[PDB]
Write a protein that binds this ligand. Structure first.
Ligand SMILES: O=c1ccn([C@@H]2O[C@H](COP(=O)(O)O)[C@@H](O)[C@H]2O)c(=O)[nH]1
Ligand SMILES: O=c1ccn([C@@H]2O[C@H](COP(=O)(O)O)[C@@H](O)[C@H]2O)c(=O)[nH]1
Ligand SMILES: O=c1ccn([C@@H]2O[C@H](COP(=O)(O)O)[C@@H](O)[C@H]2O)c(=O)[nH]1
Ligand SMILES: O=c1ccn([C@@H]2O[C@H](COP(=O)(O)O)[C@@H](O)[C@H]2O)c(=O)[nH]1
Ligand SMILES: [Mn+2]
Ligand SMILES: [Mn+2]
Lengths: 183, 183
């Protein structure tokens, strides 16, 4: 692929989890997408729901069992045989074809929260990325203050799973690329 | 002081630390600036060099021994009697005076990294912020790819002192506001 190894390609990711604090909580779902510098979806990596026992799946926060319930996720985690070290091996591998090492920031909405869980649980996948984040939610906060009509064009999406979400982030940033940035 | 309490005020911060890994490293300095939504500086918070022992100061990572050595920070931390507890309480009270709880993201360059330290070491202070980050380095990464010439106007400065580092973040964002956003 002529684009593969382009220095300016971006790794986008979302995670789902059992909650907000890494000390306690664990990664349930993970999805990746690669884009070029202009935000064209170049390639997908794997979408892993991770194997998590019923004790863990029963002891999430009340937000988590209610929303990961109604959106067959917790059921996907039970029925999954995917390990976290196998999601990591397949996650890294996918990414590494596409970008040189330490080039792309980690991209997503509130991607620092995700990077916390990546940093503890998946520390070798993290090592491929530039230390920076490209947090789409930074631009949202600027839009809210500087040009909030722009938010009318942003598609909200009720879902809470890792591909729905990441795809939603890419497309948010597309809207800002078109109506908020001057390029 | 008229703008004290406005929902859309931004809390800006920069920390210096003994190193890049919260697990082992600690906070040596914090500076906070409040701006309005438009980036007019409204207040400067109290700057603290956090008291540390000769044991901590002499065995931080070699980057730090040199640049904190150079900068007069290592020495400000020797003479300081400021506990992280006091710095936290004071910084919280300052920020409460200017922005309602839960409204402002945490603002600066690669601010997710400073959030890691605040989360571990100053949890009460973190609780003031919205969960989101307003990361100027996200916009720097976008400018690199989409309008790299804008970076000629960004002013860089060598100082690695919290106050100087945050004023520089604010000013970098002012440059993008003018050259890179379509307001
Ligand atoms: O009110 C909330 C919203 C989200 N989450 C956590 O944040 C993770 C990522 O959320 P998102 O990608 O659905 O925003 C979820 O899997 C869940 O663990 C919560 O604990 N409470
Ligand atoms: O109270 C909350 C609600 C959501 N999230 C996190 O915020 C992100 C959603 O991003 P945003 O698009 O709302 O900024 C997810 O990573 C989710 O885990 C929090 O940390 N705290
Ligand atoms: O090459 C570096 C760059 C940064 N830092 C750590 O990150 C902190 C914050 O960086 P900055 O605000 O000076 O950029 C420094 O106090 C230092 O602990 C290093 O250890 N080595
Ligand atoms: O090699 C480096 C240099 C800086 N930093 C972190 O990034 C910040 C500088 O951010 P930026 O302005 O380069 O994005 C510093 O405060 C530091 O904590 C790193 O992790 N690695
Ligand atoms: Mn998310
Ligand atoms: Mn810094």
């Amino acid at each position: 692929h002529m684009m593969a190894g382009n220095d300016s390609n971006l790794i986008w990711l979302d995670l789902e989890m059992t909650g907000l604090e890494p000390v306690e909580d664990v990664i349930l779902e993970i999805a990746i997408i690669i884009t070029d510098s202009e935000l064209n979806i170049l390639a997908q990596g794997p979408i892993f729901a991770i194997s998590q026992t019923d004790d863990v799946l029963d002891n999430m926060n009340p937000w988590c069992i209610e929303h990961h319930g109604k959106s067959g996720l917790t059921q996907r985690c039970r029925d999954s045989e995917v390990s976290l070290a196998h999601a990591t091996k397949e996650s890294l591998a996918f990414v590494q074809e596409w970008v040189p090492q330490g080039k792309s920031p980690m991209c997503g909405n509130s991607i620092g929260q995700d990077r916390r869980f990546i940093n503890k649980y998946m520390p070798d996948f993290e090592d491929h990325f530039h230390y920076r984040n490209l947090d789409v939610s930074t631009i949202k906060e600027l839009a809210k203050r500087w040009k909030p009509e722009v938010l009318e064009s942003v598609v909200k999406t009720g879902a809470h799973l890792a591909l729905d979400d990441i795809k939603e982030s890419i497309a948010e940033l597309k809207v800002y690329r078109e109506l908020f940035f001057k390029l």
